[PDB]
Amino acid sequence: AMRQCAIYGKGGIGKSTTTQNLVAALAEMGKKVMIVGCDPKADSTRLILHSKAQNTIMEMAAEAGTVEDLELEDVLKAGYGGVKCVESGGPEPGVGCAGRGVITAINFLEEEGAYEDDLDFVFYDVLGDVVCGGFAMPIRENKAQEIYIVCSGEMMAMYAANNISKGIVKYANSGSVRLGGLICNSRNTDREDELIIALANKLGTQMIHFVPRDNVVQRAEIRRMTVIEYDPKAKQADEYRALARKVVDNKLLVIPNPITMDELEELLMEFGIMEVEDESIVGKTA
Amino acid sequence: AMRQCAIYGKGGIGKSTTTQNLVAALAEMGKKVMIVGCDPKADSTRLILHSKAQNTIMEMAAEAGTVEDLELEDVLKAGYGGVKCVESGGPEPGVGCAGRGVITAINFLEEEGAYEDDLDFVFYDVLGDVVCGGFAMPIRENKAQEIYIVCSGEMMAMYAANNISKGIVKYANSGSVRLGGLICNSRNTDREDELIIALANKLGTQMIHFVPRDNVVQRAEIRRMTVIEYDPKAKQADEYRALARKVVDNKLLVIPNPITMDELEELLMEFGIMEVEDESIVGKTAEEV
Numbered sequence A: 001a002m003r004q005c006a007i008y009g010k011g012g013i014g015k016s017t018t019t020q021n022l023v024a025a026l027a028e029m030g031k032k033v034m035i036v037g038c039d040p041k042a043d044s045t046r047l048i049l050h051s052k053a054q055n056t057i058m059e060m061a062a063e064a065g066t067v068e069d070l071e072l073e074d075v076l077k078a079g080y081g082g083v084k085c086v087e088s089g090g091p092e093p094g095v096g097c098a099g100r101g102v103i104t105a106i107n108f109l110e111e112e113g114a115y116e117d118d119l120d121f122v123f124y125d126v127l128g129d130v131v132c133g134g135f136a137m138p139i140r141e142n143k144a145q146e147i148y149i150v151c152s153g154e155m156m157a158m159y160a161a162n163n164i165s166k167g168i169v170k171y172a173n174s175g176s177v178r179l180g181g182l183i184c185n186s187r188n189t190d191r192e193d194e195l196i197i198a199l200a201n202k203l204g205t206q207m208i209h210f211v212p213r214d215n216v217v218q219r220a221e222i223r224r225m226t227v228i229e230y231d232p233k234a235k236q237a238d239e240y241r242a243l244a245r246k247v248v249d250n251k252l253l254v255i256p257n258p259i260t261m262d263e264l265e266e267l268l269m270e271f272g273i274m275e276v277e278d279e280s281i282v283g284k285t286a
Numbered sequence B: 001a002m003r004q005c006a007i008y009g010k011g012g013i014g015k016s017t018t019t020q021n022l023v024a025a026l027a028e029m030g031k032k033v034m035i036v037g038c039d040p041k042a043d044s045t046r047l048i049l050h051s052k053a054q055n056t057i058m059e060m061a062a063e064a065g066t067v068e069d070l071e072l073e074d075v076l077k078a079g080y081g082g083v084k085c086v087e088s089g090g091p092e093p094g095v096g097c098a099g100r101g102v103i104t105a106i107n108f109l110e111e112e113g114a115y116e117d118d119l120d121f122v123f124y125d126v127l128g129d130v131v132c133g134g135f136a137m138p139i140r141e142n143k144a145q146e147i148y149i150v151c152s153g154e155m156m157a158m159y160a161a162n163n164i165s166k167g168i169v170k171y172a173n174s175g176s177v178r179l180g181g182l183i184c185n186s187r188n189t190d191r192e193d194e195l196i197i198a199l200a201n202k203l204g205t206q207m208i209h210f211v212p213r214d215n216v217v218q219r220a221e222i223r224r225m226t227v228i229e230y231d232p233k234a235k236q237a238d239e240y241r242a243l244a245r246k247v248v249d250n251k252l253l254v255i256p257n258p259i260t261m262d263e264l265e266e267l268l269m270e271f272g273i274m275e276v277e278d279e280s281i282v283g284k285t286a287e288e289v
């Protein structure tokens, strides 16, 4: 039947691009997928739809008075491989919870039966700069059971994974939401794959795939398309295909073991990222 | 006339180092300052204390278990230049609003009237990756009147600056929140300064200062300190003194005019940051065209 998944991760590391490329490979693979973007910014579906900006449930809800009038064919658009797409949107900056649009989107897609009309996978593309309120909603309310975290060999990207992992632990007994693995969005750093393999193993999970940097990505993106649709013969298309296959066959769905800041700093030092703390040099620079 | 300000900015671009070096320069100027870090991670005060990490309210509100119970000795540590350094901390991921650490910290400080105890400036150091009721609090409750936005010539940093501006807009009437200007932390991008100047102009504000990249910052950072206390005779040290004096003497506090996504992307394109889309090849595979 359908598997409800979610790709979580900090902003600015190529997450939405990795999600849409993984989803296109799934669709190329024969799977029927729906992406539910949850970033207030709404940039989780444009490569599937070759679009400027998809109209968000929130923008619309603010138009015909409320979300009761909203039509499903106006909210959900289909694109490459038949992948269905919806954007939650979000409130105006500073007004309430920035990630609440998800609750509005999920509740609407529910009433409209969207989740039963031929779907093998549902992927919520959620931000993880903070894990609270609307952002933690797909986990809290047991809306996505298979969580895959996008990260890179950088402090903040790693910190976010840890806190998201924390969020999963907190709702452990709450449902069947579990961590399926870390996806490394390479930032062309030395020993980056090793660094994430190191953290995933420390978390009690797996680095399900290391996504290399490759210009073909931007060449595909400038045309509002995924690498799978733009250049199927490319080396990078295979990478997304590999990820897709492992996600499809994934069996490792665990309750993570959140590390501590010191461990975090340990991996970073250990892998050529952070420098070992000199000591005579502190407190009284000169 | 104690001035309450806030430095907002996207994370990952040295904002806190700028806030701290800014406050240090201010301190050297003989100004009495206090930094309220409102970042979950809590790195808004290390450089001032020469610490690895300062204890937050949240953490020690989970020791005594009750919001109020921490004389400013264990919670409010004064460090370099007499700058009082405090940290809000945040709650556990999934435990209520992450802005609980902020909303807490202030009331607590207003309860000890730490604001009234010999102070010229208070700077809340807040992250702008998420502009929601939780983190817009200082603005919303009228806790911070003078806002300064740290940004760089990059998409998210400028997007974050526009969103902070939207939040300033929203409350410009209920209180006296105003945007003092943009602070560009250079990330070594061409035309970065001119891009931010341009953005300042569009937003209807000013780029109060361009903070350059100087390895003496990373140098003094390792020492767990500011560039000011480190080597006050550094060329970079003078950039903070300059920014500081413009902050002290800033008359220009305005209500920002946010721009649309087009205007922003427009800006980004004319400065060579964002690629101009070729309409014809959109949705065509590499073999087709």
Ligand code: SF4
Residues within 6 Å of the ligand: A096, A097, A098, A099, A130, A131, A132, A133, A134, A135, B096, B097, B098, B099, B130, B132, B133, B134, B135
């Ligand atoms: S729960 Fe988080 S995203 Fe929501 S308003 Fe609070 S701090 Fe912001």
